[PDB]
Curated annotation (Swiss-Prot), chains A, B:
Keywords: ATP-binding, Cytoplasm, Ligase, Nucleotide-binding, Purine biosynthesis
CDD domains named in the record: PurM
Pathway: Purine metabolism; IMP biosynthesis via de novo pathway; 5-amino-1-(5-phospho-D-ribosyl)imidazole from N(2)-formyl-N(1)-(5-phospho-D-ribosyl)glycinamide: step 2/2
Catalyzed reaction equations: 2-formamido-N(1)-(5-O-phospho-beta-D-ribosyl)acetamidine + ATP = 5-amino-1-(5-phospho-beta-D-ribosyl)imidazole + ADP + phosphate + H(+)
GO biological process, one term: 'de novo' IMP biosynthetic process
Gene Ontology terms, MF aspect: ATP binding; phosphoribosylamine-glycine ligase activity; phosphoribosylformylglycinamidine cyclo-ligase activity
Entry GO terms, CC: cytosol
Gene assigned in the entry: purM
Name the record gives this protein: Phosphoribosylformylglycinamidine cyclo-ligase
Enzyme Commission number(s): 6.3.3.1
Amino acid sequence: TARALREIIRTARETFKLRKGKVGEPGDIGHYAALLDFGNFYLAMTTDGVGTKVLVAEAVGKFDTIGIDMIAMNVNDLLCVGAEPLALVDYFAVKEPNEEVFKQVAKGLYKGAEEAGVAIVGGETAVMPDLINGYDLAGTAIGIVEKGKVITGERIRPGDSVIGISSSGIHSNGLTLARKLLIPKYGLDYEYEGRKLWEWLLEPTRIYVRPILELINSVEVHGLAAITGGGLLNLKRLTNYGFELEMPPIEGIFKLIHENGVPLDEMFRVFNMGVGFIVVVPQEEKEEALEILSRHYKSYELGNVTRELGKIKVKNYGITL
Amino acid sequence: TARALREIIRTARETFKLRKGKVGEPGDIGHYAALLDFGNFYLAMTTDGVGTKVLVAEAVGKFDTIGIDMIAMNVNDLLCVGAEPLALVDYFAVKEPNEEVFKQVAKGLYKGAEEAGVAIVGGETAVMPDLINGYDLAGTAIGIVEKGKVITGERIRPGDSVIGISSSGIHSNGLTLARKLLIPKYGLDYEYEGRKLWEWLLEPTRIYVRPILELINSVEVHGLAAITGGGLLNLKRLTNYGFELEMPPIEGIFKLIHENGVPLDEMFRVFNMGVGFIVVVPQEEKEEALEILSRHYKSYELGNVTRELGKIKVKNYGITL
Ligand SMILES: Nc1ncnc2c1ncn2[C@@H]1O[C@H](COP(=O)(O)OP(=O)(O)NP(=O)(O)O)[C@@H](O)[C@H]1O
Ligand SMILES: Nc1ncnc2c1ncn2[C@@H]1O[C@H](COP(=O)(O)OP(=O)(O)NP(=O)(O)O)[C@@H](O)[C@H]1O
Ligand SMILES: [K+]
Ligand SMILES: [K+]
Ligand SMILES: [Mn+2]
Ligand SMILES: [Mn+2]
Ligand SMILES: [Mn+2]
Ligand SMILES: [Mn+2]
């Protein structure tokens, strides 16, 4: 995967010079979004799909929230460079132009867009039954951040406070592993802690736009990280410094997954494990930050930045990533 | 397909108010790209995938042109509102991370981006074998257009000259019909007019950024249309006025398709039939427009706009769409 992707990454970096010194000149690839120089401001650009979670939605005929996942994936990435999300286009590659599915998808697209404060301004619909075994939903979002107000993690210093905002659940990463491990063993209707397995797998991703925009307009912020592919390893994209964390207890779907063989170190590398978004602020602003975030979502002090470069220590679990 | 899409379109229109009176306020859905009000200028945004052409690519192992198809699909759409393409992200949804496939894909991505003058600033790579029976490659492009320089077709009037720029071949629409009709009977190694069928089907989509940007900066232009899904029906997106046209002779892959039982009136609603891009100019600019475009690609005077609303007459073929 990394060897295959490197070919595209290297080609992409080569094309940067086509906009050198011109409107749209990019920064480097690697962060949660691209930053494009528009003179007075940066434009942020990101793209992501929902993933195989759509296979669960199709099974129970509930696409009412897949659109929330898609918008969440994209606007939460815009936040991680300090950008205010503005607009989105959706790429909907489907096996069939089913009017019932499309009606369900539209409902969540509105709900997500409302929560994020963005307009859905266009898109593409590709009926490709030979290529698509379901209803793949992806999107591309753009946002804006003023020059001088970009947050990429370069300000992170040892001793900074690390705060986690709770997730709504599995969100949109690790779905294939969870599906193949749990569905054939327990059945989609398996009731676990009052919710069916498909209810655990379909829980829409949380949208962090409002608490994070409030936070960056109120306190000093040194880093912002959506916990997606790679789980806690996403923190290393922000800085070479280390992290000393205490993660919340494993429960819900994550407990179920863990009890079915998956080791905890792999799980902190795959699932958000209850923390959907992480902010890094100076210790001076920790209490103020907790209060702003905790108005909107249950939020924790996870730990501190350390000088153990490149290491993430989950102390209460005896794990280093 | 139209009724299913109506659900998302109406919902996306409802989200416009979330950006009303703000940076990024959108125009209406329906055109080749969306236009977002950034004050001194509009930002153009569009997204599109390659389509089932990637299935032919996988069948024969030739992947170094679908990356051109993806970039062409998106930058040619930005041209159709008068915008200069700036930047693109790509969405690569794959059954597996085959390093050979990704190396080929990156070659075409570089060639396309260099021809269009865009930087590939980021992207997404998603391995989902349960969902994707191949290598689905899509993208999202961003462009810029000044206030008062947008070209939508609103200025098209009866009498206007209609000019077509030759396509390189099938481009990226109608591939599903072409696949199911030709591949079982002939196979991808069948030679037609000195070229293998896979050479016909994988010829990369032409990029029109250079001739079109030169054109709108030189003469008055009333309409621009990439000839994609629905073939010549795309002209009806620019205006309700009619068209009287003389289309090029049916040659190459289109003749082979026609001769295998596809009627001519269906082919003009599916394939570009040799015309990849159409521009509408006032008669007084016709010669100068032909001159600029002929410096880049073979270009034709196709005909004129008429007062026979809602119809496209292909006179030399006796067809009315
Ligand atoms: N196919 C691609 N083409 C170009 N850039 C890509 C591609 N895939 C990934 N990238 C870039 O590589 C970096 C890492 O990508 P990715 O791992 O998708 O980040 P993410 O979106 O934060 N994680 P996730 O939401 O789990 O996919 C980003 O800056 C992307 O822009
Ligand atoms: N899933 C979608 N969500 C939102 N808008 C959409 C969606 N699909 C299509 N649209 C919009 O509907 C209009 C027509 O779409 P489309 O038929 O894809 O245009 P095109 O890209 O010019 N043609 P093609 O290249 O053949 O796909 C555009 O303005 C799109 O932005
Ligand atoms: K991203
Ligand atoms: K488009
Ligand atoms: Mn992401
Ligand atoms: Mn399209
Ligand atoms: Mn298109
Ligand atoms: Mn991604």
